[model samples]
Target: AEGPVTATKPKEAGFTSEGLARIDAYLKNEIQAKTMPGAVMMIKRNGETAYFSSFGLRDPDTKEPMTAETIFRIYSMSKPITTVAAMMLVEEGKLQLDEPVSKYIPSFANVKVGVETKGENGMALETGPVKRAITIQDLMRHTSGITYGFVGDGLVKKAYIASNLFDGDFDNAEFAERIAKLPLVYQPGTTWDYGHSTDILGRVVEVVSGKSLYQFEKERLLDPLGMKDTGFYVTDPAKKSLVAEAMPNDRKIGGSEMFDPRVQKKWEPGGQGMVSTIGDYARFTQMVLNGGTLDGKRYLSPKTIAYMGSNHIPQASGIVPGAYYLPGPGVGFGLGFAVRTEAGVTPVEGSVGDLSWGGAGGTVFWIDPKENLTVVFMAPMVSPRARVWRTLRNIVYGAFDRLE
Candidate 1:
């Protein structure tokens, strides 16, 4: 039932024919300019494939052309899927979003928050008790005060680095234990700090599901959704060759071998540890677009999907933490994705209630529920200072002269 989008023309699906061709030219120009190695873009609306295009090289040295099957390290893109996996348990009565995380994992019982004093190098770090225990919803919405070690520098980040909390050596259980020892960057459910929240969510899933994160996701999500090419590792030699390489600049900014899928990590990092292809991820995006169902099977109820897709941020400004993947003026964090709160303040094109997410390695996908449309763009080449998705969004939205 799934195939590349070529036979279906744009005008047949309520898109401007000329606008669809512009999508092709835009990607090619980026490749020729050396902004990225390659890209794969797929657009679908109202159960119709409107446009799909592949561009540039998968491997610059070998001159490999990008293909639909090429795999990309979907870093944070793993969050929404993992959140979906958890949503299955939520529907099954195995988990509750508002419940304290300590209820599932005992290691979270004695969490603390770190207080920072105005001092050089944040040397004046103090540990204080959190006002409240972190909840499952907090992790889901990134309201938990976790800070990524590689992204920012602060008292909590310094502690995360010294502890090696995410060195890929510790399994989910040990990972949770080490993280419990560190002070939270903020109190639970206070400010949005997008660090180990999802990883901790994975640990909670492990304790409740009685299976490893990898096993649970495969059984509950990947198999059911037909994401056959998506997983924690890319073991197939052919698929391994299709793995896209990050640009030189991508490595210079927050780079790590942890992003490499060939390393066969023992840790199944929920926050960022999956390799997926454009074809496979299209299925995942379609499921989200379909309100948590695909191919006549339901993974989540329409009610729960609405709840998860809506913004959970209590206030607008100053909720996002630091400069790491922070949304601008009119954006808010949803259950596992970024929700567009207003149409104008966002730099990208889309309506309010649009849910989107992107990876550190230049993989982005968004669902415009108002438009009944979803788009996936994958470029293995990442740039810390690039906004390829914004450009792609403007082009795709501009292609629609009027919403169908």
Candidate 2:
């Protein structure tokens, strides 16, 4: 059976020991300054860990030290996992990429698109039928013409917010129904507005598999991968203490102060609902880096993994990262993760073929196929992730004596 993930010394893993120490110091210092509550970082290269450490407190009030096992609400990072689940169904012939979503979710047939006009006063918004039907591929790439309420102040966005569209009161099916009733922000396959597409994708999974998104994912991915601590909710009350806390921010919205992980919710949101640990998430990232198989069990074919990691959006395409707006220039959207197309453009150091993504909760992970490296950074603080991401990239890549 596949066992637990193990680590080796930095030198043994081809990373400079001194450079790795810088990474450790960075995290500890961030915690000391109160910029970060707590964080768990794991870096593995060439089948062995080069650096792994936990810093700060999972519970700042109780002074609970952060551990590798600390649970975190990974936010949009959950999208990749959701995407993988849908692809598994694709491999089973239960779903097709280009098929119209209405095939499974009938309400999608009546979905409409939004048009905006600028008037002397301010702006005017209009609604019309979609130029093209949204498909599974469109949803996967965020080209489904869907937009999140919090993404902007457009008329359609206002409609979403006023309707409480993203509230946790509904399951995936109900979520999709509500979304279908709204107008699209753009034509399907035309613009990349990161919104409710992934949530709808989760609903598609439920409809096609005849099971809840969580059930299908648990059996197909989580259980086999040994992600025991990951789920839509934390069932064990005792383990709830391990959940990380976000630094207080006045800009936070939608009661973003915290989420009760142990509380049962009607919706298992695919866009941003799952809680996971760095170790558990490392296993998942390792599997993707290993080309979709772990411990001799094939969760997905190598070709499928490759397809998912490669850029699906064309260059110069108006696929706005939208809403969350995480991906930088010189990058492109793959099936789930952001594929780096140019190495030197960003402030961080990354290989051209690297696949990376982050959660709104400040968690980030990246898999570099060329270097056979994967990094997982789990922290509850939102802003620190961006700075730490850049420093971590420079420190990690700088330490590499050679790239295999």
lDDT of each: 0.81, 0.83
Error of 2 at 343 (Å): 2.2
Model 1, position 214: C-alpha lDDT score? 88
List candidate 1 stretches off by more than 4 Å. 1-5, 119-123, 252-255, 316-325, 384-386
For model 1 the TM-score comes to 0.93
Model 2, span 267-333: residue lDDT tens: 8888888999998899999999999999999999999999999888875655555544557677788
lDDT of 1 by residue, 284-307 (tens): 989888887899898898888898
lDDT of 1 at 297: 90
Candidate 1 lDDT score relative to the true structure: 0.81
Cα RMSD of all models vs. native, in order, equals: 2.9, 3.4
lDDT of 2 at 216: 91
